[PDB]
Amino acid sequence: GSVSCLANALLNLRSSTDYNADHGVKNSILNFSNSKDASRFDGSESWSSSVLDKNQFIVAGSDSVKHFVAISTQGRGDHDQWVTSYKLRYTLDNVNWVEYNNGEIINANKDRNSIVTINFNPPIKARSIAIHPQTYNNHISLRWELYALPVKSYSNPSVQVGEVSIGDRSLNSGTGSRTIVRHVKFPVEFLSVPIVSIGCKKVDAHTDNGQMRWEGKSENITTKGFDLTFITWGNNAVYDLTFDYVAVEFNN
Amino acid sequence: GSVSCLANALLNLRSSTDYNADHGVKNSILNFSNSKDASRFDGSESWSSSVLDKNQFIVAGSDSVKHFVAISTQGRGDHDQWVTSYKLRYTLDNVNWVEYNNGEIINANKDRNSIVTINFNPPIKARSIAIHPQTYNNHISLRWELYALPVKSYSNPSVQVGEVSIGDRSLNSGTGSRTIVRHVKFPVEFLSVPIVSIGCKKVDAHTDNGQMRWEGKSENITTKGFDLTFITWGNNAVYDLTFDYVAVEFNN
Amino acid sequence: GSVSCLANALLNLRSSTDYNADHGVKNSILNFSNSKDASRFDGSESWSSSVLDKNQFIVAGSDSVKHFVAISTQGRGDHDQWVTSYKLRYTLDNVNWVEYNNGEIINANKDRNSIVTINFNPPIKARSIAIHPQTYNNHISLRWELYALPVKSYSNPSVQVGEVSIGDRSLNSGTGSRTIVRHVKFPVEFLSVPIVSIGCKKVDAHTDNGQMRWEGKSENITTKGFDLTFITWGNNAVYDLTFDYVAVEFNN
Ligand SMILES: CC(=O)N[C@@H]1[C@@H](O)[C@@H](O)[C@@H](CO)O[C@@H]1O
Ligand SMILES: CC(=O)N[C@@H]1[C@@H](O)[C@@H](O)[C@@H](CO)O[C@@H]1O
Ligand SMILES: CC(=O)N[C@@H]1[C@@H](O)[C@@H](O)[C@@H](CO)O[C@@H]1O
Numbered sequence: 001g002s003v004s005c006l007a008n009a010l011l012n013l014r015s016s017t018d019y020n021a022d023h024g025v026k027n028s029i030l031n032f033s034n035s036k037d038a039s040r041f042d043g044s045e046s047w048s049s050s051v052l053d054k055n056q057f058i059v060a061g062s063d064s065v066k067h068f069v070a071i072s073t074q075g076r077g078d079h080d081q082w083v084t085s086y087k088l089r090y091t092l093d094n095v096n097w098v099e100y101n102n103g104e105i106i107n108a109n110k111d112r113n114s115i116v117t118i119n120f121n122p123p124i125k126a127r128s129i130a131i132h133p134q135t136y137n138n139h140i141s142l143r144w145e146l147y148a149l150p151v152k153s154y155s156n157p158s159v160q161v162g163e164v165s166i167g168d169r170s171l172n173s174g175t176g177s178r179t180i181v182r183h184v185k186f187p188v189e190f191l192s193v194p195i196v197s198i199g200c201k202k203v204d205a206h207t208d209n210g211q212m213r214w215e216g217k218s219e220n221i222t223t224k225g226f227d228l229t230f231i232t233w234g235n236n237a238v239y240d241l242t243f244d245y246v247a248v249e250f251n252n
Numbered sequence: 253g254s255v256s257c258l259a260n261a262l263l264n265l266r267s268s269t270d271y272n273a274d275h276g277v278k279n280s281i282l283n284f285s286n287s288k289d290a291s292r293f294d295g296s297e298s299w300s301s302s303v304l305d306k307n308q309f310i311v312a313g314s315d316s317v318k319h320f321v322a323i324s325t326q327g328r329g330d331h332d333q334w335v336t337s338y339k340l341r342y343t344l345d346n347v348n349w350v351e352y353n354n355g356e357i358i359n360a361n362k363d364r365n366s367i368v369t370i371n372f373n374p375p376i377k378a379r380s381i382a383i384h385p386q387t388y389n390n391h392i393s394l395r396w397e398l399y400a401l402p403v404k405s406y407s408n409p410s411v412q413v414g415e416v417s418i419g420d421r422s423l424n425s426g427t428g429s430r431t432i433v434r435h436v437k438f439p440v441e442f443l444s445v446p447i448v449s450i451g452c453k454k455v456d457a458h459t460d461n462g463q464m465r466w467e468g469k470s471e472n473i474t475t476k477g478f479d480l481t482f483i484t485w486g487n488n489a490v491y492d493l494t495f496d497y498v499a500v501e502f503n504n
Numbered sequence: 505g506s507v508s509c510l511a512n513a514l515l516n517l518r519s520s521t522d523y524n525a526d527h528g529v530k531n532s533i534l535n536f537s538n539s540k541d542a543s544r545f546d547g548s549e550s551w552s553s554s555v556l557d558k559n560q561f562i563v564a565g566s567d568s569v570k571h572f573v574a575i576s577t578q579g580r581g582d583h584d585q586w587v588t589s590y591k592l593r594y595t596l597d598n599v600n601w602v603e604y605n606n607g608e609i610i611n612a613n614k615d616r617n618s619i620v621t622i623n624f625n626p627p628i629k630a631r632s633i634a635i636h637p638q639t640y641n642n643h644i645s646l647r648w649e650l651y652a653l654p655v656k657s658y659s660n661p662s663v664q665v666g667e668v669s670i671g672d673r674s675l676n677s678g679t680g681s682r683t684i685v686r687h688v689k690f691p692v693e694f695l696s697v698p699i700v701s702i703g704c705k706k707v708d709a710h711t712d713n714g715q716m717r718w719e720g721k722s723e724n725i726t727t728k729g730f731d732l733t734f735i736t737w738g739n740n741a742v743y744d745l746t747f748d749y750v751a752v753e754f755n756n
């Protein structure tokens with residue numbers, strides 16, 4: 001139950017330099033492998049930089065706030081090149097960048113194919129993150145994956161709002177349980193059925209021997225609207241009631 | 253009124269293998285065309301794989317939940333290569349992947365340039381989606397587009413919250429319609445004017461010959477704040493009232 | 505306090521044509537520079553088109569609504585090629601595209617390395633934006649950056665909702681300040697502590713010599729739930745009260 005970010009095409013990648021396009025970030029996913037034909041080159045089984053120094057990197061980013069729980073790195077699949085240590089940097093706001101664990105130099109790879117995995121406890125909370133190779137065998141060449149928490153069912157909800165009143169004397173007389181319905185139409189139709197939350201912002205009602213009785217509920221909710229059922233009981237005379245409603249659509 | 257996803261640069265793409273960088277996913281949009289100069293190669297008018305088998309794919313992804321309504325595929329513009337059938341797979345959570353229509357093998361292209369379009373009824377609801385070529389003429393080479401519903405006006409709203417009370421005896425005496433205003437300042441200024449929803453969470457008020465009368469409304473809403481107007485009428489003495497407010501900014 | 509979009513890997517890029525993959529959009533960030541080795545080509549210090557006409561472009565996009573505040577362009581770092589003027593187009597819905605400032609032809613570069621910056625007042629509000637070169641020295645070749653407002657702390661909140669009542673006669677007798685607590689468990693645990701907004705949707709209560717007194721508040725809020733404290737005072741007998749709650753989690 002972690003998300004493989006690169007495997008799912010969830011992040012944009014950007015390297016400092018590329019040896020050429022046949023060594024670009026597009027070739028960098030963990031376990032990347034291509035044709036084992038030696039007579040025709042189809043690209044490195046890695047990102048490989050052009051410049052060899054301590055200033056190269058790949059940035060991975062997108063708009064969403066991610067909770068990164070691990071990173072895995074690997075050397076290059078088709079030649080003896082691998083990153084032996086690296087630093088990490090990240091940003092939540094895309095303005096201020098932070099050094100992971102005070103600029104910790106993480107021990108990394110020692111061969112082409114063995115995976116080295118570092119776990120983040122607590123998760124790194126970030127929009128963008130950058131791997132910064134510090135040392136290497138032969139060339140700055142790597143494959144990698146970033147692991148994040150899945151998105152919660154409750155995130156990114158859609159919302160519409162409005163108000164509803166009795167607007168007449170429908171509940172202003174009589175005895176026992178008495179109800180009226182006001183049908184509400186959402187300004188725009190939802191793609192799935194929302195929930196509808198309500199809160200009273202006007203009471204104009206008479207007590208019944210000192211007892212106040214009123215209720216509202218949302219019912220019969222559809223993509224297009226819902227019913228506000230206004231309720232009184234005993235012998236209360238309710239002159240008017242008003243609710244604000246907040247309709248919330250999830251997972252869409 | 254559908255959105256052309258690749259045309260709008262809305263999705264990250266990732267292929268299994270590329271013949272080389274000059275045949276990568278960057279060349280895969282429907283109707284992609286480049287220089288018709290035969291003396292200098294500027295890349296294939298297609299994505300083309302490196303390995304030829306039944307295991308190649310392109311994944312298209314981003315963080316947002318998309319409602320995919322169609323897919324179009326095409327062969328390669330500058331050579332006789334095209335995909336003749338394919339399967340589709342998708343994921344909503346980026347953990348669990350689903351086979352489209354029980355692993356349906358979709359009949360696809362028979363030439364370089366004719367478009368073949370499949371419509372999804374109901375839409376495929378997904379964060380990432382993958383085209384998996386099964387058979388081909390000459391090479392696994394294609395162009396394509398994914399079509400999605402546009403984003404609703406009501407999605408991804410911004411929210412700020414707080415509470416407001418009378419806090420004094422301003423409405424606790426007198427006759428007829430009586431009102432007071434409490435100006436509220438949002439903790440942070442909005443980029444556009446929000447709506448402001450309210451709900452009562454405290455009443456401390458005297459009836460007027462048994463009649464209860466109170467109201468709140470939000471008014472004079474700006475990017476910076478709003479006015480909670482507290483209202484009573486008849487001869488009611490209102491000691492205190494409290495509302496929670498929810499301010500919602502759309503389309504920003 | 506603006507965000508450098510390409511530097512942070514925040515946008516997908518898509519060109520009309522590329523001279524080849526070694527001249528693609530991946531080489532287009534402002535101040536892009538690679539190996540100054542003349543004996544081995546590692547790609548142009550620019551995006552460069554393949555076709556030379558007035559119809560080439562790069563589209564930059566993602567799902568989020570961005571407020572673009574500036575654009576900077578530069579020519580090519582390693583050869584005498586630069587764009588001398590261009591037009592801009594953008595879209596908020598990814599269906600309807602708009603010409604910036606009525607199709608204004610913007611004066612651009614006159615050398616390899618000097619930066620030319622245009623500021624947008626008001627910001628361009630858009631999901632995708634496209635630079636459309638009109639004239640050029642030698643070739644359509646450029647580097648660039650797009651600048652946007654940072655995301656507000658209040659955007660993309662997570663939400664859960666529910667209702668809570670006294671459900672018994674706990675507050676229906678006695679004298680002075682009397683309170684009861686109902687512990688509420690969120691259907692799903694949050695990653696950080698939310699706020700909890702409330703609004704009354706049922707009153708069943710007796711006045712005390714004509715005075716109505718009731719209150720609710722949310723307290724002891726955690727990732728897992730909160731306490732609704734129901735309150736009365738004086739000599740009021742409260743039979744039942746019901747609140748809808750809206751719990752909002754920010755910045756996650
Ligand atoms: C069924 C019915 O009317 N029930 C009410 C109850 O809700 C409450 O208001 C009470 C106050 O003494 O009076 C009655 O028992
Ligand atoms: C204008 C005015 O005071 N209107 C009120 C009305 O709102 C309601 O409370 C009624 C109850 O009998 O008493 C009056 O008519
Ligand atoms: C402490 C206490 O009971 N205060 C109350 C106050 O809240 C209000 O209801 C008032 C009405 O005359 O009666 C008392 O003073």
Ligand SMILES: [Ca+2]
Nearest residue numbers: 034035036042
């Ligand atoms: Ca190979």
Ligand SMILES: [Ca+2]
Nearest residue numbers: 286287288294
């Ligand atoms: Ca060509």
Ligand SMILES: [Ca+2]
Nearest residue numbers: 538539540546
């Ligand atoms: Ca160079």
Ligand SMILES: [Cl-]
Nearest residue numbers: 207210459711
């Ligand atoms: Cl009364």
Ligand SMILES: [Cl-]
Nearest residue numbers: 203455464707
């Ligand atoms: Cl009341």
